[PDB]
Design a protein around this ligand. Structure first.
Ligand SMILES: [Ca+2]
Lengths: 54, 224
C-alpha cells in the first residue's frame, strides 16, 4: 500500500531530492520532497526505493 | 516560482542559493557573515552560493562559501510549521559588491496590500515539474491576515503571513523555500509552505521575519 501512494511533495517548499515508486511505470522516479509531511512513498535513492517497492 | 518572470541578472544581490551537491533551497544575505533561510531547509552541511543567476553555469562572479554554523530556530516544529526560520553563518565573510549585498531587516510587520518581490529557482509548474536554471521573480502583494487564515483554517500561526494571489497561477513552489520576500526594501518574509503551488484560494505562506528580529540579533551576537 505504501508503494501505491501517489508522490507527495508535502506543503513545505524545499527540494530534497527523493524517489517514489510510480505505479504507472513499475519503477521509481525522482521528485522534490518539500521537507515536511508527505507520505511513505518517499525514498532517499532510486536503489533504496526499488529495494522497498520493486 | 509559478507565473513569474526571469529576474534581471544580479538585480537581487541578496538572493543566495543553498547547495549540498545540488541547489535545494534559497536564502537571503542579511550581513557579511549571515544568511536567513527556512528551518525546514536544514542540512548538516551547506555550501552558500552568492552572486548567482544561472545555478548551472559557473560564470566566475559567484562566491561559493561553506557554512560554518547552521542554526534552526530552536522552536521550529515540523508538524505546525511554526518558527520556520534558520540562520547560517558563513565560514568567511561575503564580499559586498554590485552582485552580492545585504537586504535590510524589517522595521515593522508586513502591511496588507504592499507590493513585494518573491524570488527563487523553484518549480515553475503547478502540475508537472519544470525547474529553471535562471533565477525567477514574482511581483506579489501581501494578503490580509483574514485572507491567509480563511485559506488555511486553524493553520496560520503568529509567525506566518500570506503573499500572493487568491485566483491561482502565481506563487512560490518547491525549491523556493528559504528565499526572500522583499517589500519596500526590507526582508519581510521567508518562503515557507503552501497547499500545492499556485492553487486557487491557497496562497503562499511565509515566515514573518519581523517577529524574529530579536532572535536574529541574539543569535548573531552569541555566535560571533
Ligand atoms: Ca552561476
Amino acid at each position: 500500500e505504501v508503494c501505491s501512494e501517489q508522490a507527495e511533495t508535502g506543503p513545505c517548499r524545499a527540494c530534497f531530492s527523493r524517489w517514489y515508486f510510480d505505479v504507472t511505470e513499475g519503477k521509481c522516479a525522482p521528485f522534490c520532497y518539500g521537507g515536511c509531511g508527505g507520505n511513505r512513498n518517499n525514498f532517499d535513492t532510486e536503489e533504496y526505493c526499488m529495494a522497498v517497492c520493486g | 516560482i509559478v507565473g513569474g518572470y526571469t529576474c534581471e541578472e544580479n538585480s537581487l544581490p541578496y538572493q543566495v542559493s543553498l547547495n549540498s551537491g545540488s541547489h535545494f533551497c534559497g536564502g537571503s544575505l542579511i550581513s557579511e557573515q549571515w544568511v536567513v533561510s527556512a528551518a525546514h531547509c536544514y542540512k548538516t552541511r551547506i555550501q552558500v552560493r552568492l552572486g548567482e543567476h544561472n545555478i548551472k553555469v559557473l560564470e566566475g562572479n559567484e562566491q561559493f562559501i561553506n557554512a560554518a554554523k547552521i542554526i534552526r530556530h530552536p522552536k521550529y516544529n515540523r508538524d505546525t510549521l511554526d518558527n520556520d526560520i534558520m540562520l547560517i553563518k558563513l565560514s568567511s565573510p561575503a564580499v559586498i559588491n554590485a552582485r552580492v549585498s545585504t537586504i535590510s531587516l524589517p522595521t515593522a510587520p508586513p502591511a496588507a496590500g504592499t507590493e513585494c518581490l518573491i524570488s527563487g529557482w523553484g518549480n515553475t509548474l503547478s502540475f508537472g515539474a519544470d525547474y529553471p536554471d535562471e533565477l525567477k521573480c514574482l511581483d506579489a502583494p501581501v494578503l490580509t491576515q483574514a485572507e491567509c487564515k480563511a485559506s488555511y483554517p486553524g493553520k496560520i500561526t503568529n509567525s506566518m503571513f500570506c503573499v500572493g494571489f487568491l485566483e491561482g497561477g502565481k506563487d512560490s513552489c518547491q525549491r523556493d523555500a528559504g528565499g526572500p520576500v522583499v517589500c519596500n526594501g526590507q526582508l519581510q518574509g521567508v518562503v515557507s509552505w503552501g497547499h500545492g503551488c499556485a492553487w486557487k484560494n491557497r496562497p503562499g505562506v511565509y515566515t514573518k521575519v519581523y517577529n524574529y528580529v530579536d532572535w536574529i540579533k541574539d543569535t548573531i551576537a552569541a555566535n560571533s
